[PDB]
Design a protein around this nucleic acid. Structure first.
Ligand SMILES: [Mg+2]
Ligand SMILES: [Zn+2]
Lengths: 52, 234, 55, 45, 111, 162, 392
RNA sequence: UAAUAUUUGUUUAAUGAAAAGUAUUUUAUUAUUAUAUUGUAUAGUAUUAUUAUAGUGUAUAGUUUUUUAAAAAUAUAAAAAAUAAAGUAUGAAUUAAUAUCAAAAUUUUAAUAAAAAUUAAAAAAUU
RNA sequence: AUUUUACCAAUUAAGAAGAAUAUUAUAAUAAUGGGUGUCUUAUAUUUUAAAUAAAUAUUUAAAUUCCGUGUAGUAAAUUUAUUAU
C-alpha cells in the first residue's frame, strides 16, 4: 500500500490493516470489563495549561 | 607535514593535537628517549620529525609502493575549482542569478558562502597552480575564468571577494615556516590572472573539416565574453 | 606445548626450506603449442593431438 | 596499588613485538627495565 | 535541565536522527533560548583562521577524495566473505605479490 | 624459496574496536563528515560480497568437495515453534514501523488536502505549497512540489527501467 | 571442565553436566555471519539450527515491493517514455562536449606517460551507446584518444554525426519504423560507420582483437551501401584473424569478395577480402586452397601488393588429422590463459556443467568411469543389462 | 597448542521392522462391500553416534556413498605377510608469567636448584 | 648474468533507524485462581480448624538458667496506608 500510494498519489485515511495492540491479549480479558472510576487523581494534566 | 596535511590538500589537519580520533593517546609511535613518557618535548623540530614521519600514509599521502595522484596538472585543478562552484550554488539558483537583488535570505548566505569557500581553496591550490601554467592547456586556461564566474566571483585585475586581505595583526599572524600560506593573495592572484591571459593569447596565436571551423568560431567567441565578465580584454 | 609461543617462534618456521619449498615457490611453465594453455613440462592433456605427440 | 601504567603505556614503541602489542606484558617489561636502570645508575655506573 | 539543548542527553541515548535534525545546522544557547546557527569549520587561510560553511566543506572533501581515488589508472576489487582462513590465504597470497597479471593468473592456475 | 613471506603480527593479536558509551562518538561535534575509509586511504571499485545470493555458485565453486555440510533440507530443531527474533532486527522493525504503536494517529487532525502550507523545518524550509494527499495513519503529508525525489520503476517483460 | 567461556561460541573445552547446551549444528559466529550459514540461508530457507527466525523483510522491500506497480499506472507509463530523436541529439551533444575537452597526452622522453583516465567519458558514452544501440569499447576509445590522428577522425566524425542528426532524421530509426510497418546508406550513417571503424582501428592498436571484431558487427549492421559492406566485411575478416576466429574470418572474408561486381573500381576492399579468406584458409593449414585463392586474386586483380606479399610469403612457406592443431598466434594464448583447465580447478575433475547446473565429477552425466555414480546403478529390477558377473 | 589430531564415501545379501511419542505428503490413495468417526513414510542414548531394543512372519530382489606412489615403531595375523605416516581440503583438545633464550661444567646459598658467581662454548629447519 | 644479500615495523575515529511506548526504585483508589488458535456435559469442577503472619510493632529501668532475653494507649473509626498504565 505504501508503494501503491506513492505511485497513484491517492490519500489514505484509515490504516489498511487492523492492529491489535495487545497482541491477542485482549481476548484474554473478559468481555464485560471496564476500568473503575478513579477519584482525585494525582496529576497536573486536568488543569489545562498551555504556557508552562 | 608529511602525514596530516600536504601542499595542495583541502584539509586543515592539526598534526600535534589529535582532534579526529575516538581514543586517548595510548602509544606514541616515534619516540627517541624513554623520557618521552612524561615530557615528550614535541613541538621541537627534531622530535616532531620523528613523530610525524612515523605516521601511516593516508589517502592524501599515497605512500611509496602505492601509485599517487596527478595533482599538479592544471587540467585537474581547474575542474576541481569548478566542482566547488556547483557545490554552494545550485543550477536553479545559478539561473536566477544569471538573469540579474531579490533573493531568499537563506539563499543569499549560500552565495556569500560560495564566495568564501572559493577564496579559500583558491588559496590552497595556487601554489600548485603557479607551478603548472607552463604546460596548462587551452580549455583549462579558460576554465579559470569559467569557474570564477560560476562561483559568482570577479577576479582582481585592478561581486568580488578576492581583493581584500583577511584582517589580523602581523605580530599575531602565523608565520611558521613549512606551512604554505601565501600572505598576499590579491597580489598573487592578480598576477596569476594576468599570466593566464597572456598565455591564452600565446595558444590562440598557436592555434591559427567543419570541426575546427565551428570550434574556432565558438571558443574565440567564448574568450571575449568570459574575459569580458572579469573586465579583461584580449 | 608448555608455554605460549611469541611472534618470533611463529616466525621461525618460515626461515626453513621445507616451508619455502612447500608454500612460497613459483612454478616453471610455457605455452602448450597445441592448446595454448599454460603447461608444466611432463604433464599433458586429454586431446588426441596431445597424446601421440605430447608437447 | 600504583604501578605507573598510564605513563609507561606511552613508551611501548621501544619494545619489540610481544611487548609492544599486548599491554600488561609491555608494562612489566618497562617497569623491570626502569627499576633495573635506576638501581644500576645509583650504585654502579 | 532548565534548558535542554537538542543534541544533549537527558534520560536518553545517542539517537542521532533525533538528536540533530540537521547535521549542517548547529544549536547553541543564546539569551536563554535555543538559537540555531550555521555550523562552521575553522580553516587556516592567510595565517589567521577563517570560518567556512561546514556542510559544503565536508561534502567537498569527500567529493575530492572520491575523485582523486577514481581518476587514478588502477582498478581495486574487494571480495568479501572469501571461504578460506586468514593464515592459509595469506600464505597463498604472498606468492603473487608484485607479479604481472599474466604470471599471476598462470601461477594461480598451476597450483 | 623465491617468494618472500614474513608473518603479519595482526593475526597474532586482534583486539576488538572500542565500543561507544551511550552511542556517543565523542568527536562527532568536532571532526568533519568525511568517510573514515577515504581519509584512511581505503577505496574500492567493486565490493563483491559472497554472502549475496547471486554470487552463491562461485562461493561453492571455490570450496573443496571433501568438506561436507549436513542438514541441507531438514533441521535438528523443529522450526515451527514461535520464538522471538534477535534484538537488533526487532529494533529495525520498531524504527521502521512506528505507526503500529497505540495512538500514533494525531488528535483532532487538521490537515486536509487543498490547504496552503509552509515548511517550517528541515529541507525546503520556507516553501509554500498545497496539500495534495494525506496519509493519515502514518502522520504524513504530501505537499505540492516539495520533497520531490526519483522513483525507480523496474524492468519487466515489456518495459525498461524508468 | 570449563577451560573456556560459558557462551555457546567460546573457544575451549566444555562439559555437558556443567555447561549444558543443545545441539547447534552451524551456529553463526560473533561477528559477520559467514558464507556457510548464508549458503544455508539462500538454499534451505533458514540457518541450519532452526533457532534463527528467518527474517527477510529487508529484501522484500528490495525486490517485491519495488516491482509492485499497479496496472492503472503501468498502462500509462509507456505513453510518457522519452523522445528518442531528442535523446540521440542530447547524447551526441554531451558525449562530443565531453570528448572535446579530453587533454592532449603529454609526450615524455625516456619513459611512457600514463594517459589520463577516461572516467568522465563513460557516463555520456553509456547513454549514447544504447540510445544508438551499439556497444563501444572503452579501451578502443582511450587508444583513439591517444593518437592525434585517430582523435581527429573520431572528433570530426562525431561532429558530422551530430549535425546530420540535428538537421536530418535518424536513419536507423527511419528504417526501423519502415521495416515492421532498401535505400543507400544516408549521411549520418556514413558518419557513424566511419567513427565506429575509427574506434575499432584504435581498439586494434591496443591489442584487444575480440572486442575490435565485436564492435564492427554493429558497424556492418548500420551499412546498406555495398562499398561500405565490402570494406566492413574485409575489416571484420582481419579483426577476426587476429582474434583467431578462423570460421569468422573465412566467413566474412568471402562476402567482401562477393561484392566485387557492384563495388566501385576505386576500392581496395574486395582484394582485402581475398587476403583474409586466403589467410584464414592458410591458418587452418590448408595451404593448397590458400594458394588457389591467392591465385584467384592475382587472376582477377592482376598484381596486388598484399597479394604480392601473400603470394610470395605462401611461396616461401611452400596430414588431415593434425590440421589446425597448432597455436600460431598470441591472442589465443591470451584466451588460453583464461578459460583453461588448471591443476585442481576448471578441469573435468572438479565440477562439471550439466544444463547450467554444477555437479561433482562423481555425478558426471557424460562419464561412467570409476568412482562415477552410474557404475553403482544396478539393473533396476527389469532385465539384465550386461553379462558382468560380479559388479552390475 | 595448530602448516596438529580427527575426517576423509571406488561397489550392497541392513530380508524384516508394530515398542519411535518432533520431520508442511498442495489431492499419498478403493476400484469398496460396505455403512458414522478417527489415524498410516527418516530424529532412543546432547549427533545423520559403537549402532539400537523386541513381537510378528518368511530363504537365491547381490535390496548399490569409504580417500592415498617407499622405510622405522605401534595394532592383527602368519623376525616375513596384511594395515597406517611428505600428502590437496576441513580443522578441534590438553597447555600457555615471561625477555629472540636458557646448551656444558664447578662450587656456594635456609631443602632438586633452569638462583647466584666463574669458566665456558649452545647456528636454522624437519623427523 | 637467470638474481637488487639474509634479517628487522606498527596499530587503526565507526559506514549507516542496527538500541527506546527501554532497566531499577517510585502511584497507598482495582483485584474470586490471566490464557488468545476460544465454544454441551459436571454422577467426575469442595479446603474448611482460636497459635508468628503474604496482617511485619515510637526509649537505655526493673526482674529472670548471673553471662544474647528486654519499653508498655496516644488519642477512643484519626489522617501509616499493600498502592500500579
Ligand atoms: Mg551500534
Ligand atoms: Zn595440449
Amino acid at each position: 500500500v505504501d508503494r501503491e500510494v506513492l505511485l497513484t498519489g491517492k490519500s489514505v485515511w484509515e490504516c489498511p490493516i487492523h492492529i491489535d495492540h495487545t497482541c491477542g491479549g485482549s481476548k484474554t480479558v473478559p468481555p464485560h470489563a471496564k476500568k473503575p472510576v478513579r477519584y482525585m487523581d494525582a496529576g497536573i494534566a486536568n488543569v489545562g495549561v498551555t504556557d508552562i | 607535514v608529511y602525514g596530516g596535511s600536504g601542499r595542495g590538500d583541502l584539509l586543515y589537519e592539526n598534526p600535534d593535537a589529535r582532534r579526529h580520533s575516538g581514543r586517548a593517546l595510548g602509544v606514541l609511535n616515534g619516540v627517541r628517549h624513554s623520557s618521552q613518557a612524561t615530557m615528550p618535548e614535541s613541538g621541537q623540530l627534531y622530535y616532531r620529525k620523528l613523530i610525524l614521519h612515523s605516521r601511516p600514509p593516508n589517502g592524501s599521502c599515497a605512500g611509496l609502493q602505492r601509485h599517487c595522484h596527478d595533482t599538479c596538472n592544471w587540467s585537474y585543478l581547474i575542474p576541481s575549482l569548478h566542482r566547488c562552484a556547483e557545490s554552494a550554488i545550485s543550477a536553479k539558483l545559478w539561473e536566477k542569478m544569471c538573469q540579474l537583488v531579490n533573493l531568499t535570505q537563506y539563499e543569499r548566505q549560500r552565495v556569500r558562502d560560495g564566495q568564501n569557500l572559493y577564496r579559500y581553496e583558491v588559496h590552497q591550490r595556487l601554489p600548485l597552480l603557479e607551478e603548472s601554467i607552463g604546460w596548462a592547456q587551452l580549455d583549462d586556461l579558460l576554465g579559470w575564468f569559467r569557474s570564477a564566474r560560476r562561483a559568482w566571483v570577479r577576479l582582481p585585475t585592478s561581486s568580488s571577494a578576492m581583493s581584500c586581505r583577511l584582517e589580523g595583526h602581523a605580530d599575531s599572524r602565523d608565520t611558521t615556516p613549512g606551512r604554505n600560506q601565501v600572505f598576499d593573495t590579491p597580489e598573487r592572484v592578480e598576477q596569476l590572472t594576468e599570466a593566464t591571459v597572456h598565455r591564452i593569447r600565446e595558444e590562440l596565436q598557436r592555434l591559427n573539416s567543419a570541426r575546427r571551423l565551428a570550434r574556432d568560431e565558438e571558443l574565440s567567441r567564448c574568450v571575449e565574453e568570459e574575459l569580458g565578465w572579469h573586465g579583461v580584454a584580449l | 606445548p608448555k608455554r605460549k609461543k611469541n611472534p618470533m617462534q611463529l616466525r621461525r618456521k618460515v626461515y626453513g626450506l621445507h616451508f619455502k619449498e612447500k608454500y612460497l615457490k613459483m612454478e616453471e611453465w610455457y605455452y602448450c603449442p597445441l592448446c595454448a594453455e599454460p603447461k608444466k613440462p611432463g604433464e599433458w592433456c586429454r586431446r588426441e593431438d596431445c597424446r601421440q605427440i605430447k608437447p | 596499588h600504583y604501578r605507573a601504567k598510564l605513563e609507561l603505556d606511552r613508551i611501548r614503541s621501544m619494545l619489540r613485538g610481544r611487548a609492544r602489542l599486548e599491554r600488561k606484558v609491555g608494562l612489566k617489561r618497562l617497569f623491570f627495565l626502569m627499576r633495573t636502570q635506576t638501581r644500576y645508575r645509583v650504585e654502579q655506573q | 535541565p532548565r534548558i535542554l539543548l537538542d543534541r544533549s542527553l537527558w534520560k536518553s541515548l545517542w539517537i542521532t536522527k533525533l538528536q540533530l535534525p540537521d547535521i549542517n545546522r548547529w544549536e547553541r544557547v543564546v539569551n536563554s533560548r535555543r538559537v540555531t546557527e550555521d555550523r562552521y569549520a575553522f580553516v587556516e587561510e592567510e595565517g589567521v583562521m577563517h570560518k567556512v560553511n561546514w556542510g559544503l566543506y565536508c561534502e567537498r572533501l569527500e567529493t575530492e577524495l572520491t575523485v582523486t581515488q577514481e581518476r587514478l589508472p588502477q582498478h581495486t576489487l574487494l571480495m568479501k566473505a572469501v571461504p578460506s582462513s586468514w593464515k592459509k590465504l595469506d600464505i597463498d597470497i604472498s606468492v603473487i605479490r608484485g607479479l604481472s597479471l599474466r604470471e599471476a593468473m598462470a601461477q594461480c592456475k598451476l597450483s | 624459496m623465491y617468494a618472500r613471506f614474513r608473518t603479519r603480527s595482526k593475526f597474532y593479536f586482534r583486539p576488538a574496536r572500542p565500543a561507544l558509551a551511550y552511542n556517543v562518538d565523542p568527536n562527532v561535534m568536532r571532526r568533519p563528515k568525511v568517510k573514515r575509509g577515504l581519509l584512511k586511504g581505503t577505496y574500492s571499485d567493486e565490493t563483491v560480497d559472497l554472502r549475496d545470493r547471486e554470487r552463491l555458485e562461485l562461493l561453492e565453486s571455490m570450496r573443496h568437495p571433501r568438506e561436507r555440510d549436513f542438514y541441507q533440507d531438514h533441521t535438528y530443531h523443529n522450526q515451527w515453534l514461535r520464538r522471538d527474533l534477535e534484538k537488533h532486527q526487532k529494533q529495525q522493525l520498531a524504527a521502521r514501523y512506528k505507526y503500529f504503536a497505540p495512538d500514533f494517529e494525531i488528535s483532532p487532525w487538521i490537515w486536509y488536502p487543498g490547504d496552503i502550507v509552509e515548511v517550517v523545518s528541515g529541507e525546503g524550509i520556507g516553501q509554500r505549497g498545497t496539500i495534495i494527499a494525506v496519509i493519515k495513519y502514518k502522520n504524513e503529508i504530501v505537499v505540492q512540489n516539495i520533497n520531490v525525489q526519483d522513483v525507480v520503476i523496474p524492468a519487466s517483460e515489456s518495459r525498461p527501467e524508468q | 571442565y570449563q577451560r573456556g567461556g560459558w557462551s555457546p561460541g567460546s573457544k575451549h573445552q566444555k562439559h555437558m553436566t556443567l555447561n549444558p547446551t543443545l545441539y547447534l549444528y552451524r551456529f553463526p559466529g560473533p561477528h559477520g555471519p559467514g558464507p556457510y550459514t548464508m549458503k544455508y540461508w539462500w538454499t534451505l530457507g533458514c540457518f541450519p539450527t532452526g533457532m534463527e527466525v528467518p527474517f527477510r523483510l529487508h529484501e522484500f522491500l528490495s525486490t517485491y515491493q519495488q516491482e509492485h506497480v499497479p496496472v492503472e499506472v503501468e498502462e500509462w507509463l509507456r505513453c510518457y517514455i522519452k523522445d528518442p530523436l531528442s535523446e540521440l541529439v542530447n547524447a551526441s551533444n554531451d558525449f562530443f562536449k565531453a570528448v572535446e575537452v579530453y587533454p592532449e597526452v603529454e609526450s615524455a622522453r625516456g619513459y611512457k606517460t600514463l594517459q589520463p583516465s577516461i572516467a568522465p567519458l563513460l557516463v555520456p558514452m553509456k547513454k549514447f551507446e544504447e540510445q544508438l544501440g551499439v556497444k563501444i569499447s572503452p579501451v578502443g576509445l582511450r587508444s583513439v584518444l591517444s593518437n592525434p590522428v585517430l582523435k581527429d577522425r573520431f572528433l570530426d566524425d562525431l561532429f558530422d554525426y551530430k549535425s546530420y542528426v540535428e538537421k536530418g532524421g535518424s536513419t536507423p530509426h527511419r528504417r526501423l519504423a519502415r521495416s515492421r510497418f532498401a535505400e543507400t546508406t544516408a549521411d549520418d550513417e556514413r558518419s557513424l560507420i566511419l567513427l565506429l571503424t575509427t574506434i575499432s582501428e584504435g581498439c586494434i592498436n591496443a591489442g584487444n582483437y575480440s572486442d575490435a571484431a565485436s564492435v564492427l558487427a554493429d558497424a556492418l549492421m548500420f551499412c546498406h551501401d555495398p562499398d561500405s559492406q565490402a570494406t566492413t566485411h574485409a575489416n571484420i575478416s582481419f579483426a577476426s584473424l587476429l582474434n583467431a576466429d578462423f570460421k569468422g574470418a573465412e566467413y566474412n572474408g568471402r562476402e567482401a569478395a562477393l561484392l566485387q561486381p557492384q563495388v566501385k573500381p576505386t576500392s581496395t576492399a574486395c582484394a582485402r577480402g581475398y587476403v583474409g579468406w586466403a589467410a584464414a584458409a592458410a591458418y587452418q593449414d590448408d595451404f593448397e586452397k590458400a594458394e588457389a585463392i591467392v591465385k584467384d586474386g592475382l587472376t582477377l586483380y592482376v598484381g596486388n601488393e598484399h597479394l604480392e606479399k601473400l603470394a610470395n610469403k605462401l611461396q616461401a612457406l611452400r596430414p588431415r588429422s593434425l590440421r589446425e592443431s597448432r597455436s600460431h598466434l598470441p591472442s589465443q594464448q591470451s584466451r588460453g590463459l583464461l578459460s583453461g583447465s588448471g591443476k585442481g580447478f576448471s578441469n573435468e575433475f572438479d565440477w562439471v556443467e550439466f544444463k547450467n547446473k554444477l555437479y561433482p565429477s562423481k555425478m558426471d552425466p557424460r562419464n561412467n568411469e570409476m568412482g562415477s555414480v552410474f557404475r553403482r546403478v544396478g539393473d533396476l529390477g527389469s532385465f539384465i543389462s550386461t553379462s558382468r558377473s560380479m559388479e552390475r
